[PDB]
């Protein structure tokens, strides 16, 4: 998907433009009002981001972590044997 700058994303949010956002560490998927999609990255840790998102009424979603299966360790350690 067409990547976008962070500054463009904030100029986006300030104008009632974002519907849903997923947050994973710092990679983000976005869906505008107009049924388009793209991706973005957060460069540096930000305290004021989340509240700025929330106040303007955007739908915000999170994702569960991926836990490494023990069977993967079984394979990698036991591949020689």
């Amino acid at each position: 998907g067409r990547k976008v700058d962070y500054s463009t994303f904030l100029q986006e949010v300030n104008n009632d433009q974002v519907r849903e956002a997923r947050i994973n560490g710092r990679e983000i998927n976005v869906t505008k009002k107009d049924s388009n999609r793209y991706t973005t990255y957060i460069p540096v840790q930000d305290p004021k981001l989340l509240d700025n998102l929330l106040t303007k009424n955007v739908k915000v979603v999170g994702e569960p972590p991926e836990e490494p299966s023990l069977l993967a360790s079984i394979f990698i350690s036991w591949f020689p044997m």
């Binding site: 009632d16 505008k32 009002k33 107009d34 049924s35 388009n36």
Partner: protein, 133 residues
């Protein structure tokens, strides 16, 4: 020579198999060869050969609402504040693709001028209570 024939047959079979593809729940699309406009397609059961043509989804039937705002200026030397909302859907994928770039922003920039034009004539109280219709 048998190995060469078998390899060529397998290559062409993999070619053809990778040619097939899918479309998702009634979204119109335009697929064109070399860039020359070929034909549309309805969802499901379509096959794209490789390195001739390009497949474009449109995501048609969606509701696609936008917004507007502005602390504006009214007739009798007074200041108001308003909002707006508009819903639209796409009919022909072709013209929507090949008229302007980022076509949504076009409607967005148009609606602000439209709203100012309409709000200009009237005065304060009419804009407040009676006359929204």
């Amino acid at each position: 020579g048998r190995v060469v024939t078998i390899a060529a047959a397998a290559i062409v079979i993999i070619w053809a198999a990778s040619g097939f593809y899918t479309i998702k729940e009634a979204e119109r699309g335009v697929v064109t060869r070399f860039g020359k406009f070929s034909h549309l397609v309805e969802p499901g059961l379509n096959w794209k050969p490789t390195f001739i043509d390009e497949v474009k989804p449109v995501n048609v039937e969606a509701v696609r609402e936008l917004a507007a705002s502005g602390v504006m200026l009214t007739s009798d030397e007074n200041v108001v504040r308003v909002e707006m909302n508009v819903q639209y859907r796409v009919t022909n994928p072709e013209k929507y693709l090949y008229s302007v770039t980022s076509p949504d922003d076009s409607l967005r920039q148009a609606t602000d001028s439209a709203l100012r034009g309409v709000i200009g004539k009237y005065t304060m109280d009419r804009i407040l209570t009676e006359g929204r219709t």
